[model samples]
Target chain A: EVKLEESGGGLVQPGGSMKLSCVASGFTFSNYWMNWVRQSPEKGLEWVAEIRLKSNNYATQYAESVKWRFTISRDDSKSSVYLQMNNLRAEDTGIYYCTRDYGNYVAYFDYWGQGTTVTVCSGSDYEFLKSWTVEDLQKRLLALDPMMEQEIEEIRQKYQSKRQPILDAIEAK
Target chain B: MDVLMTQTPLSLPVSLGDQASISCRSSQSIVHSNGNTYLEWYLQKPGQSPKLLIYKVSNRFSGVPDRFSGSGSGTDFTLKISRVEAEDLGVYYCFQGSHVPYTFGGGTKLEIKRGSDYEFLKSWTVEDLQKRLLALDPMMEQEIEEIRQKYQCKRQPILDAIEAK
Candidate 1:
């Protein structure tokens, strides 16, 4: 009956920060540990952080790759875990999954969240893409260079063709 | 970062009711200060996220069938599945949490054998087949390089500017 729920992710500027949430049910929040594992199309899966609560004390651990920029914490009474990350980068574009660790110091992730999508803008130029349609952005970019106009559609098509399979693979899982 | 998990038999072929064993070797001892070896095993079933099978070297997670077992300590560990079922066909990975930056094994794929009764799986759609293939092979370093190249090619100046900044 255990369940972990996390929702909608959003775009972040480079070096920006965001807070991700996971709500747990059907289990004692303080009795188990919570974990964050991220999946990326380029790098696959990575363990990011974990946290546990005991009485008034808490123990936490983080992957070296993001130890400096990520914080994992929880509110036992509320049955929720939170992950705060800063210093974002293009590499952070992926799905962030919150999981419940097997209690009593065993660290296997038993229950998992559906995953929250997080996309860090590749650069400042792409920031507006979140609010603006890709087609409109592409047309605008094409207008800036008449010589590049003819090849834009082909390049976009190729990119989508190559990217779609990866997206499909991720979604299937 | 001090520990590395090396799993064997990247591909596993099995028939219904067969037993499957996967080995995970750690680069160093995984015994933590508390005298516990924080080794874990996971199964990534087709078209679903990974689920925990075993934890702490030998304990099965909640709701895990008794057919799945774990053993070993220090630097070696194993996950064994007795009477494997169709739902068990997927990729298996081992993980060590005894050290900082806990690492995962390369993964072992559990595929049905040619003569198995589950031959109907061969007729799965291309999309399903491709997803299974990706899970088996995974995104390797070379593939990462290729994707990185594509990313750079598509946004050369923007990426360069971001990197420089």
Candidate 2:
């Protein structure tokens, strides 16, 4: 099994940069590519890029555009990799996730960090919002409408009619 | 290519508080009478990794916002974002949900696209890679054959069980 231990400094100014680290334990860090994923209040998971620890090579379509501001590095001795996003903006505030890419060709995040939320709220005082309230809302909604009741059922039927062919092809696999 | 591609590129542009729709196409079907559609939606903001919005097409994953929704059927589908928020500025993508070798749509960037500001990237198609592998690797070709036979055999039993239920 593999684990990603994510940690970083507190709040930073909008124009300043922050450094975050992902330490791997009970696994071979070199064998897996370490990736940084960003999530904001407005958007969902967006793939930034991934770094190959063994060769220290990173690949991403946005690399050239953001190369000057973003950097990733790995320390073999420490068994940890670092991700630094410079020239931060208010838009950069969100939870940062670290994932291990096992090169399974599928390239999905099987092992993930618990996620650390960082804000761009400058000044001297800053506070982290509790995500549990959102969780509570989801629980209440789900309890009231199990299986999404009306909405999910409608979507299910529509998806069924449209996705039938794709399912047939997969079954034909 | 060989796939029945959508004539109109599946995308839409909308400003804050406006509604937007993004569609997806598959040359084939992706549904089962017993299960759900093997499709998903994801959103990626600037300098971020794609996040899951809708899974199996319409089922919202854990924390997805309520404004985002999905709908559609065979060979055509859509993801709708209602009353877009400024925080919702980013790119949206549709992904095939049938496991293992998954595929994604050509991404639609959601940003303030001033004149000549957007950049496009060349994407490598997973479908093309699969075809290439089957052509070059005899071992993989044999494995594919085996899997095909296995799925065929498994389907009858599953169908029978469902009917019995």
Candidate 3:
């Protein structure tokens, strides 16, 4: 019964900023943790950041991929969570989703909001990922070390086994 | 950090109104300090946002139907749907939150639960499918159970590896 609103703004140029909101309904907001997940047509789903009531000093935990550019927070008074990504790059084009952690724990996400498609582009035949091939990303994934070679191969097969689209994405520059 | 690895049937080939179930064999104990297992079931219909169905071991979320149920503990779990509906079609995931770095089962897909009742399914009585499902349960459960055991065997080494870290 809960729906997330992808309010705020979209379409930002490189080096700029983008922000969106996830307003929760049908459940008490304070009872659970709100998280942000994103996916690009060129890439699969990736955990971006999680906004929770840690009660300690730490406010959010960011995935290394987006850690440098993303921030997530919640406004309990408004029953909403927010995501803001800075230094916008064309590589960021894709859908951004907001989900709620189930059972007041950060493990399972049961409530998901419809995603917002955000396109990071500029007049300058701007590019995404900057000439990096999928293999490059794969090596990084390898460095992450949470995967097996087979699983890594399975993921590579999903992207048309090509980086042309990503290169086209950044062709703007 | 505790990890929960889950195994699901690659596919469920049936049509609407047929009874169906998905197995999730976890790799570790999802039970939290409060005596609650951090397991939950989620459904992701094609092109739609994923939704929570069960949590706290067996409690259904606010609006989830009673027909949907959850069971099992430690490293085994099951999500059962008494009568598969069109809305139930899609990928189902089992997740654990007992520890940090929460984990999710790969995913189980439930699609077109077709059978002899295909036409009458829209109005078929629920008990009939439940009965049929039980009759078929022993064999299927046995298979999943074996896989569950195999997974349990693999988890110990994984846990040792994690502990070694």
- A1-173, model 3: which lDDT tens digit per residue? 66677776455555778888989888888767778877553544455787767464337787666777888888888988898889877677667888877544433676677787676654242132334455554454344334333444454454332233323333322
Candidate 1, DockQ score (0 to 1):
0.19
How much of the true contact map at the interface does candidate 2 reproduce, as a fraction?
Answer: 0.00
**lDDT (CA) for every model shown?**
0.74, 0.57, 0.65
How far in Å is the alpha carbon of B88 misplaced in model 3?
1.8
lDDT of 2: 0.57
The residue-by-residue lDDT of candidate 2 on A24-122, one tens digit each, is 898877677777766554643444546664554544323333467778777777888787889876566667788775354332454667666565643
Winning model by lDDT: 1
**Candidate 1 local lDDT, B18-51, one digit each (tens):** 8999999999998888998888888877546788
Residue B23, candidate 1: Cα error in Å is: 1.8
Name the TM-score of chain A in model 2: 0.62
lDDT of 1: 0.74
Q: Which candidate is the best by TM-score?
A: 1
Task: For all candidates, state DockQ relative to the true structure.
Answer: 0.19, 0.02, 0.09
Among incorrect, acceptable, medium and high, the docking class of model 2 is: incorrect
- Interface RMSD values for the candidates, listed in order? 10.6, 21.2, 21.6
Query: Residue B62 CA error for candidate 3 (Å)?
Result: 2.6
TM-scores of all predicted structures: 0.68, 0.40, 0.57
Off by over 4 Å in 3: A1-3, A8-17, A24-32, A39-47, A54-58, A76-79, A86-94, A101-110, A118-173, B1-4, B113-165
